[PDB]
Amino acid sequence: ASSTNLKDVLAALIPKEQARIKTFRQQHGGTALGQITVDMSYGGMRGMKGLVYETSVLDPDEGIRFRGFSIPECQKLLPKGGGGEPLPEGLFWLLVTGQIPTGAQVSWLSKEWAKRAALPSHVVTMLDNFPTNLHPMSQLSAAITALNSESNFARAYAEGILRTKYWEMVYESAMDLIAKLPCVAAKIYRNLYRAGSSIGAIDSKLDWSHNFTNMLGYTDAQFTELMRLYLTIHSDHEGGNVSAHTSHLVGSALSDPYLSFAAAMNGLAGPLHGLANQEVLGWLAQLQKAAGADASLRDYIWNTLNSGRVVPGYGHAVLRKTDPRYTCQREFALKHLPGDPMFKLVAQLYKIVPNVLLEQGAAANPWPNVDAHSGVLLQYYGMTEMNYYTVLFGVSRALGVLAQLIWSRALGFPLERPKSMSTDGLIAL
Amino acid sequence: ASSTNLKDVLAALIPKEQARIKTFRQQHGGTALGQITVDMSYGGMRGMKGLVYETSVLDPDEGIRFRGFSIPECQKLLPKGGGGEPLPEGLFWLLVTGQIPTGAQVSWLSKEWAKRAALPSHVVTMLDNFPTNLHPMSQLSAAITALNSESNFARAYAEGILRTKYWEMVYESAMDLIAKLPCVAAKIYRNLYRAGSSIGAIDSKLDWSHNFTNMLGYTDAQFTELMRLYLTIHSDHEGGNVSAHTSHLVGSALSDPYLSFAAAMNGLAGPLHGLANQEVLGWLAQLQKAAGADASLRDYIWNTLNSGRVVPGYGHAVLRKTDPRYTCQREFALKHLPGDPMFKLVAQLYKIVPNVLLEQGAAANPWPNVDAHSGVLLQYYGMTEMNYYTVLFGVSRALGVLAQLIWSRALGFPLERPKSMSTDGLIAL
Numbered sequence: 001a002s003s004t005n006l007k008d009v010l011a012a013l014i015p016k017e018q019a020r021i022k023t024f025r026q027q028h029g030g031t032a033l034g035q036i037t038v039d040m041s042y043g044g045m046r047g048m049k050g051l052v053y054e055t056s057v058l059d060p061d062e063g064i065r066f067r068g069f070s071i072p073e074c075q076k077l078l079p080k081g082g083g084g085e086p087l088p089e090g091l092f093w094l095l096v097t098g099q100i101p102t103g104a105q106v107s108w109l110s111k112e113w114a115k116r117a118a119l120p121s122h123v124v125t126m127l128d129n130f131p132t133n134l135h136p137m138s139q140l141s142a143a144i145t146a147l148n149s150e151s152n153f154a155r156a157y158a159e160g161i162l163r164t165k166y167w168e169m170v171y172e173s174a175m176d177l178i179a180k181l182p183c184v185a186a187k188i189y190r191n192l193y194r195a196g197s198s199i200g201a202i203d204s205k206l207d208w209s210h211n212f213t214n215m216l217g218y219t220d221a222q223f224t225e226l227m228r229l230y231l232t233i234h235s236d237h238e239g240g241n242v243s244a245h246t247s248h249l250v251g252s253a254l255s256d257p258y259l260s261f262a263a264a265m266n267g268l269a270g271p272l273h274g275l276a277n278q279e280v281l282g283w284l285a286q287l288q289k290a291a292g293a294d295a296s297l298r299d300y301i302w303n304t305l306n307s308g309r310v311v312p313g314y315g316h317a318v319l320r321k322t323d324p325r326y327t328c329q330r331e332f333a334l335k336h337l338p339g340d341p342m343f344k345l346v347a348q349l350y351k352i353v354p355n356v357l358l359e360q361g362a363a364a365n366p367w368p369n370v371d372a373h374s375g376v377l378l379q380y381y382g383m384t385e386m387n388y389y390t391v392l393f394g395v396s397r398a399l400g401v402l403a404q405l406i407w408s409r410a411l412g413f414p415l416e417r418p419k420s421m422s423t424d425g426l427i428a429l
Numbered sequence: 430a431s432s433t434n435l436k437d438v439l440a441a442l443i444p445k446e447q448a449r450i451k452t453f454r455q456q457h458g459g460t461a462l463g464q465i466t467v468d469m470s471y472g473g474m475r476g477m478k479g480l481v482y483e484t485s486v487l488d489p490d491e492g493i494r495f496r497g498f499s500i501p502e503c504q505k506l507l508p509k510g511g512g513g514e515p516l517p518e519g520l521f522w523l524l525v526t527g528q529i530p531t532g533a534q535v536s537w538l539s540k541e542w543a544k545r546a547a548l549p550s551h552v553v554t555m556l557d558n559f560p561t562n563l564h565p566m567s568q569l570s571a572a573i574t575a576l577n578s579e580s581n582f583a584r585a586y587a588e589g590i591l592r593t594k595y596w597e598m599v600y601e602s603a604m605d606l607i608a609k610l611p612c613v614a615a616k617i618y619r620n621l622y623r624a625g626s627s628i629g630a631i632d633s634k635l636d637w638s639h640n641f642t643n644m645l646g647y648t649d650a651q652f653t654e655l656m657r658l659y660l661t662i663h664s665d666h667e668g669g670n671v672s673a674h675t676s677h678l679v680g681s682a683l684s685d686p687y688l689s690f691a692a693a694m695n696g697l698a699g700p701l702h703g704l705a706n707q708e709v710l711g712w713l714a715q716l717q718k719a720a721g722a723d724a725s726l727r728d729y730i731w732n733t734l735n736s737g738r739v740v741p742g743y744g745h746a747v748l749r750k751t752d753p754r755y756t757c758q759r760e761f762a763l764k765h766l767p768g769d770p771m772f773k774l775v776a777q778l779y780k781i782v783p784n785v786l787l788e789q790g791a792a793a794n795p796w797p798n799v800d801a802h803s804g805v806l807l808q809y810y811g812m813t814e815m816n817y818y819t820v821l822f823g824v825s826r827a828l829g830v831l832a833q834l835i836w837s838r839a840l841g842f843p844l845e846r847p848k849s850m851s852t853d854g855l856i857a858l
């Protein structure tokens with residue numbers, strides 16, 4: 001009997017995994033997986049195997065994998081709206097479950113996220129009174145924190161539920177949060193950039209991305225395709241990245257999914273992290289201010305470097321090759337906006353930057369990351385408000401971080417609480 | 430020539446340390462400080478030496494140290510208001526600098542934090558419109574996020590300053606943030622619990638704690654002493670704790686001090702972390718509802734345990750003995766409120782809980798932590814709104830987390846970005 005329900009699937013899946021991690025540990029918990037050095041400690045855990053995070057794994061050479069699904073595999077395997085890009089809905093199923101969803105599963109997420117998309121009065125109010133000089137990421141983060149009012153997990157906890165059921169309430173709050181996100185984000189968009197206009201209604205019959213673009217006010221049929229791709233690729237990037245790790249850390253203390261997501265956003269807002277989005281365009285924007293020669297392009301790069309600044313959109317803590325998320329984006333531009341001068345500049349930079357970065361001899365990875373390519377795509381379609389880009393990153397990232405969050409709690413992962421040391425104490429060790 | 434200035438002191442101190450960490454690393458960066466096991470990965474980094482954090486170090490047996498200054502040492506060494514408890518101002522100097530401040534240094538922090546204490550209009554507005562069912566911690570966190578508008582670091586960064594000067598702007602924003610905190614917190618207090626009343630003005634001539642208590646509306650001369658002690662002891666607890674670690678992680682991405690503090694708060698708000706504050710009182714509050722026997726006291730404890738719940742205020746990730754912060758508090762009660770029935774219940778529990786926890790055989794540390802003792806103190810003085818307690822914890826914690834934050838940036842600590850693994854991948858390793 002019956003029809004589609006992610007929660008039931010999960011109910012079936014949890015005990016097996018539980019069982020599976022127990023024996024593994026019973027046999028191997030004692031096993032040394034690595035060592036910790038002094039440089040690692042001073043170095044931001046660089047190179048330390050610190051967390052279990054199941055939804056995605058980053059290979060330094062190959063790049064991100066969703067099951068063991070690469071981006072190009074996703075692109076072919078995940079259901080599409082009709083009509084060439086993968087629906088972030090399907091990605092979400094994939095991440096949660098480990099399996100490739102059917103079109104019909106996918107429709108279910110769509111409807112589910114449409115049903116759940118509703119904003120409480122206090123939230124709307126706060127967003128409506130925010131100053132226009134308050135950054136969109138700040139606006140977003142405060143809004144999601146303020147939504148915790150509504151937390152199903154925070155409520156069940158307060159009621160004294162057995163730990164065993166945590167995942168259940170986490171799941172509800174995750175689905176709800178993902179559902180609301182586009183409304184919050186679009187409301188910020190509309191307030192800042194389209195004063196006096198309204199986000200309108202969510203239509204149950206559309207996919208999440210399309211409802212988002214409607215609320216954003218974009219009609220271009222290719223913009224919608226761009227959106228689907230964007231929100232899919234920005235999903236997740238393993239556990240060690242600042243935003244995911246923050247959610248993981250905060251979630252471990254049993255703060256609800258809203259609070260943990262919001263802290264994650266404060267992390268995504270940092271220039272070395274998601275804000276790179278924005279930083280890239282601002283830098284391109286300056287570049288152009290000051291059709292240039294490779295030599296003048298190179299002078300420009302050196303001047304940033306010589307000034308004690310980073311070249312945004314290049315480098316990576318883990319990647320050692322060009323990010324497939326970058327390629328992914330380039331391949332979209334080549335199809336759709338090949339003559340765009342911004343695009344051309346970004347293509348040109350790919351020829352120069354890494355070479356300059358190799359010359360300088362500091363960056364361990366001289367190749368571009370996702371952020372070097374995303375804004376150019378947006379700007380083409382009319383979305384030229386750069387300080388907003390990270391908000392989009394923010395919306396996507398919910399998909400991976402919440403998908404894992406549910407597992408953490410299902411698996412009963414404890415408080416994240418490593419040991420710290422001072423220099424004097426290490427000196428003494 | 431001249432008078433007092435923390436920033437100048439720091440300017441003198443930074444290069445030396447810089448120098449000191451460089452050679453150390455030049456000789457020992459390669460040195461294995463420890464190993465990583467499978468259980469550690471699944472276990473929340475339990476037992477992993479993961480971070481350098483200089484302001485304080487936690488010993489599993491002895492408990493927290495400020496330089497190498499214990500709580501009892503602090504209590505005797507740090508300047509007081511006139512008149513028995515240590516001023517959190519002095520603690521702050523201690524943490525930043527490594528040295529015990531003079532009364533005169535201490536006065537300087539006081540005046541400085543009084544000068545800087547001003548709330549921007551949009552913040553006041555938002556706080557005034559917040560619903561009363563929005564938790565005080567949520568209210569606090571959204572408020573501090575919304576303050577980033579004003580970030581000196583976020584502004585300098587945007588301007589393209591050289592990395593080398595980061596610490597300078599971090600310091601300003603830290604001093605400013607610490608200054609504003611009590612205004613924000615008191616405003617929440619006043620809105621929720623004293624509708625229609627106003628926080629009033631900060632008086633440059635008082636210490637931070639006293640201005641706070643005034644804004645809170647408390648006149649009891651002993652309440653003020655309690656406050657000073659509270660905000661001092663709650664300061665810092667090394668780097669590995671959820672809140673400090675979150676600030677550290679978020680700060681590493683170069684999100685400004687406001688954003689990083691706010692994320693820290695989302696972490697403090699979790700039940701396994703600071704919210705324990707509140708959880709303890711709520712549990713005591715229930716206990717009493719349902720002058721009891723040790724046997725009925727024990728039945729009560731088992732029922733929580735059997736229900737898949739934690740006994741709040743007991744246990745610790747790192748401590749293996751009774752928290753000196755607990756003793757510290759007990760010693761205050763014994764002096765000031767020895768006949769208080771809530772106090773008596775908390776004294777009685779200390780005789781029972783750990784024994785029940787030893788019986789159960791799960792807790793690795795069966796002894797109480799700071800949170801088991803703090804609320805009882807507050808309730809005595811009239812501050813009985815338990816959902817607010819974590820806000821106080823929040824205010825104090827700024828002291829340690831911001832003191833370190835400045836050093837991280839001074840020392841040029843990089844992005845915190847460990848490697849994660851999935852179970853399948855570990856299975857395969």
Ligand SMILES: CC(C)(COP(=O)(O)OP(=O)(O)OC[C@H]1O[C@@H](n2cnc3c(N)ncnc32)[C@H](O)[C@@H]1OP(=O)(O)O)[C@@H](O)C(=O)NCCC(=O)NCCSCC(=O)O
Pocket residue numbers: 046271272273274275276277305309310311312313314315316317318362363364365369370371841843844
């Ligand atoms: C992404 C990174 C933070 C990784 O940091 P890391 O693992 O510590 O880098 P690394 O090991 O190559 O660093 C060695 C040195 O090269 C420097 N370096 C690395 N990338 C860059 C860059 N793009 N421009 C200039 N210098 C750089 C690095 O800052 C350091 O200098 P110093 O020792 O004086 O501090 C870094 O490459 C960077 O700052 N990139 C620019 C900002 C950026 O584009 N961030 C987005 C990252 S990926 C997608 C996302 O997260 O949103």
Ligand SMILES: CC(C)(COP(=O)(O)OP(=O)(O)OC[C@H]1O[C@@H](n2cnc3c(N)ncnc32)[C@H](O)[C@@H]1OP(=O)(O)O)[C@@H](O)C(=O)NCCC(=O)NCCSCC(=O)O
Pocket residue numbers: 412414415475700701702703704705706734738739740741742743744745746747791792793794798799800
């Ligand atoms: C503070 C702690 C999170 C440390 O967690 P940990 O390092 O994973 O604890 P542990 O190593 O003793 O855990 C072994 C087992 O004992 C359980 N245990 C530990 N403390 C408690 C407690 N107070 N009540 C019942 N069970 C407990 C623990 O949850 C676990 O059960 P299982 O294996 O099925 O998940 C924990 O002791 C706890 O949950 N305490 C109650 C909440 C609390 O008071 N938190 C405040 C911590 S200190 C000050 C602050 O941070 O604000």
Ligand SMILES: O=C([O-])CC(=O)C(=O)O
Pocket residue numbers: 236237240241242243317318369370846
């Ligand atoms: O992996 C990282 O450290 C950052 C990154 O590319 C992402 O989070 O998308």
Ligand SMILES: O=C([O-])CC(=O)C(=O)O
Pocket residue numbers: 417665666669670671672746747798799
């Ligand atoms: O050390 C910890 O994990 C928690 C704690 O006591 C604090 O942060 O005050």
